[PDB]
């Protein structure tokens, strides 16, 4: 019975990521789907079907610092994990030839769907669902 | 003090590590008791 109930055309904790890595991806999805208008309204103390929009690297670090469990700061490990995600292709850039990260015109976007990030937040105890 | 600060900022191993009591503090501790010892 169990053979027919699943297609089994699938090739087969889905993504082993560090604590720094998990919050890095969580912060990016907010950037790719929340308008820049709402950055100050929600995070400062003062669309699920659409394709993600681009964002700047400064937006990512600010939100990552804003939700990380006093400040976390940006050491080498944070950037080391961020670059790996690009190498792991969970985050895309606006280029295809002669990749140069430090060129200012390159932008970033999220390559991870909603369903994967849903399960990531569960292991983090971060309630993303209340931000939309 | 300035040399200790620059050594710490540069990460040099010349700067001493504060796991033991400092020489000045232990010298003061020894002397304040030696003066009242005899």
């Amino acid at each position: 019975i169990k053979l027919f109930l699943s297609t089994d055309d699938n090739l087969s904790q889905t993504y082993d990521l560090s604590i720094i890595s998990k919050y890095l991806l969580i912060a990016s999805y907010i950037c790719s789907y929340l308008e820049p208008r709402y950055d100050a309204s929600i995070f400062s103390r003062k669309p699920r079907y659409l394709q993600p929009s681009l964002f700047a690297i400064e937006r990512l670090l600010a939100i990552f610092q804003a939700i990380f469990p006093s400040l976390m700061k940006a050491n080498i490990e944070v950037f080391q994990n961020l670059s790996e995600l690009h190498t792991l292709k969970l985050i895309a850039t606006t280029m295809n030839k002669n990749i140069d990260y430090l060129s200012p015109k390159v932008r970033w976007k999220v390559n991870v769907p909603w369903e994967i990030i849903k399960e990531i937040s569960e292991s983090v105890h971060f309630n993303i669902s209340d931000y939309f | 003090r300035y040399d200790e600060i620059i050594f710490r900022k540069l990460g040099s191993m010349l700067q001493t590590t504060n796991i033991l009591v400092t020489d000045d503090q232990y010298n003061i501790w020894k002397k304040r008791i030696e003066m009242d010892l005899a």
Binding site: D39, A40, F43, S44, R45, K46, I57, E58, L61, A62, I63, Q65, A66, L71, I76, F79, Q80, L82, S83, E84, H86, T87, N98, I99, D100, Y101, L102, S103 | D3, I6, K9, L10, G11, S12, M13, L14
Partner: protein, 222 residues
Amino acid sequence: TFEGYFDQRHTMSMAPDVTREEFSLVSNFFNENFQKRPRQKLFEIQKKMFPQYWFELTQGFSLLFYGVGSKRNFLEEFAIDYLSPKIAYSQLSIPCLILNGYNPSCNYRDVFKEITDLLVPAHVILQIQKMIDFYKNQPLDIKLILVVHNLDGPSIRKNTFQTMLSFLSVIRQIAIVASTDHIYAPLLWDNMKAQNYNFVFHDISNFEPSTVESTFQDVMKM
């Protein structure tokens, strides 16, 4: 703080225009006269780290120089005057290879030609693979000193160039010294490159003016 990021018709013609030759005048005089002694005093104090740098290099740890200010002159003094003579006069004249990253005309293939001639006894990565298998049986003796100024250089930032330099540090018989200026430089390296580079980090900020690197980009465009 991060909250400082969320909380955020004049033209340059209104400013007095300065010719290119006039620009070099004021810069040269103040770079020498202003903050002369304290920077030299800091430089002389920083020379005391040569034994630690020399010790770290022998163990197989690459040295990365970062901070505010130019670092070309500091690397020149360390490798030529202290590093190269001491190794020869203690292991018993070691060649030193200097690569400029601030020059946008640099080519990786031209650089690799020097590496092959100086190290390989007579598709760049395939040749590098051969070198690793060769130096495994070779004695762990430093043979060539490599200095890479501006590892964040415009022609050096590219992924292909970064991969070539990263594979070199696997061979223990090569000494690597590098300097960077971009703030997001660590973003250029993931685990696969950081492991290969095997860096030991030193903040060497000196506020030394970058006269040499300023030559390759015109200030008149500003």
